[PDB]
Design a protein around this nucleic acid. Structure first.
Lengths: 64, 141, 313, 191, 104
RNA sequence: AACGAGACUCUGGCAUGCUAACUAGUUACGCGACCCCCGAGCGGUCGGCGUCCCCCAACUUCUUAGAGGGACAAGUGGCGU
């Protein structure tokens, strides 16, 4: 939220979701500890080994 | 012997036959200097190989080119592609392998189809629409 | 005993080295052909920066160049190519002296005589043919010939002997006599089809091979089956040696260098391991040739390299 | 390096990327320097192939819209030579460093999307690819200058160079940095 | 006398044409008249692009038809008698031939 | 087993290999003529710029059209029974 901006990187891509395939599920490692991992929903066309810029990590996702 | 090797360039119908003959300096295109050729906003582009490779591969040749075909843009890519390729062929044939091998490596690093020809050419119009893929409007009721 | 060390490796091709031959005028050069449509004339060094660099690459053929051979003079060179035609080079810069037009299909094998006026060719036209060095057909052999493709032909020492070797895929070795063009003999003894044949420089032997698996030996002086050895699963090249009486056999994963006095294997050349899955670790060896010194030999492989070895005592 | 190409006046070294999340999606200096932003290019036929062509080239491409400027890419390079010139005089920075900052400050970090549930509109907040950030950021700042010069005495060159200053700074007096925060303001709400 | 005589061939069938050209180059070379080989000229396209429907109705479709003619010419220089001899022989398929009085 | 599918035909992208060219070009000089010192030099001479001159010159890269060759998931690494 108002906590410092986070950075987390892809470990694996899972598959595309959304109601037109518009969203992409991905599994990400938190890039400050690899024992911490969350699944996210990401809009853009992601690949492997890319880094993202999360504005929170309070949220936890698994589908929309 | 009489040192002369000829090459050509292509880009979507635009031939530019560039003979490389022994000499020194005096590179031309269409019997004109290539220091101005007239769009001259893309002027940095045809100069690009000469500038990047230095003047020390052009230290013993006169290259001259005749052109035809294409528009203003496609001609620039054709003449550039020809003089680049001319230089390579000349060293492979009258000097030695290791002479041209260096020069080949330099060009293909910043490749911009400097040793190959663009395959792409226009596709035919088929009826029921303008262009080669667009369609006229279709109204229901 | 004498054994082999891995000397070095050359690099210059983008395709499989098909044949190599060696100028005896200059052991400084060496010549090669390949399946990327070029014959490379090399400039060798014994250095460690390189063992050699390609000097030039003669170009003109529209298909692979199968076999290549030097002239007695060493200033000409002759070629056989998978385009169905031959060219006669002037080994300096290029500039073909002559191109030979005949043969319906490919020219697999080619050779250049001691007299420099007779040139033969094996073709999938099913023809042995004789060639003036003006590039016209002195004779053509098509009657009493093989009914299958002619694999490799050879010139034999013309000490007083007018004989030239021929071997086809019909499981036969035909010997032909110059200026009568008859069968001198037919030799049978290969289960598989014959790839190659070669004659000793002394001139008493014919080392022949194929997909027989066994390497059988024939006599150049009247045609007798001298003896046989088990080895050489697929035989692609053979080459006698000038400084020893050896015979060097080209199998796919390995080269088997054989002493014949008495019959024994000297060494087996193996290349260092490379981890592959499922299995693609061997590259096929297809050609080999001795140098004049007979200390060093070179080999053509299908990994696009010419591997060098050297005999150490 | 001893044959280093400029733009014909600008260094492609001394160009920083201030993210580790956007470096290697900015192309400006690995060997991507060229004297012009015109090429035959390959921007298609494989998905990962857009990120391999310069940022300066991408810029020229994306400012030629609205149905009368298409097929006039040569006119577009005229606008770019003036743009950088004005940016360098105006603040003093190497005008490529300006552009890289302008891209990094304008990219949205979360965006919303649609989801159909119960026959009523629900929205979901989601994140974005680095490749998405670049595509968006190049679009947005170019929209400002395109709009501004559409009935003004000011020329398109002047408008575009002004917009890259206010983007490269955190000023928030631009069409880009306005709309960037608008999107994020939605993404907080329906998070 | 020896006149520069040009034999133009023209047809619609490239096989039928070409073998008849070979025959006329043969009959010339047989008598060593120092003939010049075929000079194959640009093939020309007749096009007709028209509606497939009689009385418009349904989707608008057309149909490209084409006929390709072929021209090629052999230059001879020899006596006009032996020319008309070799011309008239060894021609069977529908292929036209045109003999010329003289050329420069 | 058959039809449709693919196969096929036409078209486009690859040949300094082959075949041959005053109704297609190039190169080479010979040039003589014009031109300017335009370049080394001096304005001479040598070279550059195109046209007429060109040949019973040389050649076919460029233009042309025929026969052929080339591409197969072929090779390598993953994955799949």
């Amino acid at each position: 939220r108002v906590q410092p901006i986070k950075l987390a990187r892809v470990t694996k891509v899972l598959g595309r979701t959304g109601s037109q395939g518009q969203c992409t599920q991905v599994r990400v490692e938190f890039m400050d500890d690899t024992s911490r991992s969350i699944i996210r929903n990401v809009k853009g066309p992601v690949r492997e080994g890319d880094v993202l810029t999360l504005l929170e990590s309070e949220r936890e996702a698994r589908r929309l | 012997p009489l040192q002369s090797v000829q090459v050509f360039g292509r880009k979507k119908t635009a031939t530019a036959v560039a003979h490389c003959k022994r000499g020194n300096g005096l590179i031309k295109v269409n019997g004109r200097p290539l220091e101005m050729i007239e769009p001259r906003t893309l002027q940095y582009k045809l100069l690009e190989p000469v500038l990047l490779l230095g003047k020390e591969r052009f230290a013993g040749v006169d290259i001259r080119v005749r052109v035809k075909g294409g528009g203003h843009v496609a001609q620039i890519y054709a003449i550039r592609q020809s003089i680049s390729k001319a230089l390579v062929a000349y060293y492979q044939k009258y000097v030695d392998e290791a002479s041209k091998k260096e020069i080949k490596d330099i060009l293909i690093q910043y490749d911009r189809t400097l040793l190959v020809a663009d395959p792409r050419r226009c596709e035919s119009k088929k009826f029921g629409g303008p262009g080669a893929r667009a369609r006229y409007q279709k109204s229901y009721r | 005993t004498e054994q082999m060390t891995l000397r070095g490796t050359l690099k210059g091709h983008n395709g499989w080295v098909t044949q190599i031959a060696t100028t005896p005028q200059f052991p400084d050069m060496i010549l090669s052909a390949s399946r990327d449509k070029t014959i490379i004339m090399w400039k060798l060094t014994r250095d460690e920066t390189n063992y050699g660099i390609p000097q030039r690459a003669l170009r003109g053929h529209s298909h692979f160049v199968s076999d290549v051979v030097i002239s007695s003079d060493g200033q000409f060179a002759l070629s056989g190519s998978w385009d169905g035609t031959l060219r006669l080079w002037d080994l300096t810069t290029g500039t073909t002296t002559r191109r030979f037009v005949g043969h319906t299909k490919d020219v697999l094998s080619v050779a250049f005589s001691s007299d420099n006026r007779q040139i033969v060719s094996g073709s999938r036209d099913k023809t042995i043919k004789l060639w003036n060095t003006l590039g016209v057909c002195k004779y053509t052999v098509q009657d009493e010939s093989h009914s299958e493709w002619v694999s490799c032909v050879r010139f034999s020492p013309n000490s007083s002997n007018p004989i030239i070797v021929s071997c086809g895929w019909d499981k036969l070795v035909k010997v032909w006599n110059l200026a009568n063009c008859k069968l001198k003999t037919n030799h049978i003894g290969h289960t598989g089809y014959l790839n190659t044949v070669t004659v000793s420089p002394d001139g008493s032997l014919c080392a022949s091979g194929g997909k027989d698996g066994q390497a059988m030996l024939w006599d150049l002086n009247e045609g007798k089956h001298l003896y046989t050895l088990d080895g050489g699963d697929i035989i692609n090249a053979l080459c006698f040696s000038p400084n020893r009486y050896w015979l060097c056999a080209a199998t796919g994963p390995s080269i088997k260098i054989w002493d014949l006095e008495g019959k024994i294997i000297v060494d087996e050349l193996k290349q260092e391991v490379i981890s592959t899955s499922s299995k693609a670790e061997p590259p096929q060896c297809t050609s080999l040739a001795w140098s004049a010194d007979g200390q060093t030999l070179f080999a053509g492989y299908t990994d696009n390299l010419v591997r060098v070895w050297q005999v150490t005592i | 390096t001893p044959d280093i190409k400029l733009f014909g006046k600008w260094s492609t070294d001394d160009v920083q990327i201030n993210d580790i999340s956007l470096q290697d999606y900015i192309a400006v200096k690995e060997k991507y320097a060229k004297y012009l932003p015109h090429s035959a290019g390959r921007y298609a036929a494989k998905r990962f192939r857009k990120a391999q062509c310069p940022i300066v080239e991408r810029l020229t491409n994306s400012m030629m819209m609205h149905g009368r400027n298409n097929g006039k890419k040569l006119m577009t390079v005229r606008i770019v030579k003036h743009a950088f010139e004005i940016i360098h005089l105006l603040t003093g920075e190497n005008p490529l460093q300006v552009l890289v900052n302008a891209i990094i400050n304008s990219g949205p970090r979360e965006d919303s999307t649609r989801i159909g549930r119960a026959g009523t509109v629900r929205r979901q907040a989601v994140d974005v690819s680095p490749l998405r950030r670049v595509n968006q950021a190049i679009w947005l700042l170019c929209t400002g200058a395109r709009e501004a010069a559409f009935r003004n005495i000011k020329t398109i060159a002047e408008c575009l160079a002004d917009e890259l200053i206010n983007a490269a700074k955190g000023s928030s007096n631009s069409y880009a940095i306005k709309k960037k925060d608008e999107l994020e303001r939605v993404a907080k709400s329906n998070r | 006398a020896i006149h520069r005589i040009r034999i133009t061939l023209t047809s619609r069938n490239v096989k039928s044409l070409e073998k008849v050209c070979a025959d006329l180059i043969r009959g010339a070379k047989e008598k060593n008249l120092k003939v010049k080989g075929p000079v194959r000229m640009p093939t020309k396209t007749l096009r007709i692009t028209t509606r497939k429907t009689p009385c418009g109705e349904g989707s608008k479709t057309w149909d490209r038809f084409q006929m390709r003619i072929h021209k090629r010419l052999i230059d001879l220089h020899s006596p006009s008698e032996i020319v008309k001899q070799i011309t008239s022989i060894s021609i069977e398929p529908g292929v036209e031939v045109e003999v010329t009085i003289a050329d420069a």
